[PDB]
Amino acid sequence: PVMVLENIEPEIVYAGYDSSKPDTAENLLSTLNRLAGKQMIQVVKWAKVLPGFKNLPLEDQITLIQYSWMSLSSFALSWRSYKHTNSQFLYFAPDLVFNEEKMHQSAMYELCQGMHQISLQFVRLQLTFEEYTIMKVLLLLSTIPKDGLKSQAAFEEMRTNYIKELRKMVTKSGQSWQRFYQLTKLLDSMHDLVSDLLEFCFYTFRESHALKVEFPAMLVEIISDQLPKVESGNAKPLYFHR
Amino acid sequence: KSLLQQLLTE
Ligand SMILES: C[C@@H]1C[C@H]2[C@@H]3CCC4=CC(=O)C=C[C@]4(C)[C@@]3(F)[C@@H](O)C[C@]2(C)[C@@]1(O)C(=O)CO
Asked: Which residues of A have a CB under 8 Å from any CB of B?
């Protein structure tokens, strides 16, 4: 599956950001949401051809993408931050890199700091691309409905196979045992982060009109379905620890 | 047909 993940890995997406324009929160947040829309088209194309995922019913595929989109987006952001800047900045796109200054102007400074902490962890662990690609699949399968999916057994089989796949990757001991522990603790830490990101996302989505924070059609459809489920307690995060 | 539906059933 590791060779498959390397080939289907989505190419970098440009924000189309103009650096000579004013750094207002409305402009910054709207640019990032339009970027999220373009990135998510690739994410869904990547998901569609994943070994095992293609065997889940379409309704379970939609549920998993709607629950995990924020986690996949933040994890990929930290991956680019690590690979292009050695986790000094938040590399949203090649033409949109956040420093402390942009973080303050985006009106989401603490959440940016929270997303930066994950990039810092990637530098500390010296995360490999192979480890990253399996962890991304585990994030796609990290949240399910409270009453489970339509094909819960098929889901559990796929997820166990990807956990085993991560164990096989780190065994390439002692250090490999500590690595599996550290990579799975890092996966669980995404739940707390994503909970805070979605809180601000849901607020800006509700207050889109007053705030003038644009959302592309891709994000409107996902958030319209996701928001009622999360807010009513229908989401069930899956943890490796606790 | 939603955008997620379209992209998963191409
Ligand atoms: C705090 C939230 C979390 C944000 C997201 C965090 C993860 C992310 C990484 C990217 O590479 C591009 C866009 C996204 C996916 C994002 F940066 C934007 O979409 C804006 C976002 C939703 C947010 O700032 C808003 O709600 C703005 O409305």
From this structure: 41, 44-45, 47-48, 58, 61-62, 65-66, 217-218, 221-222
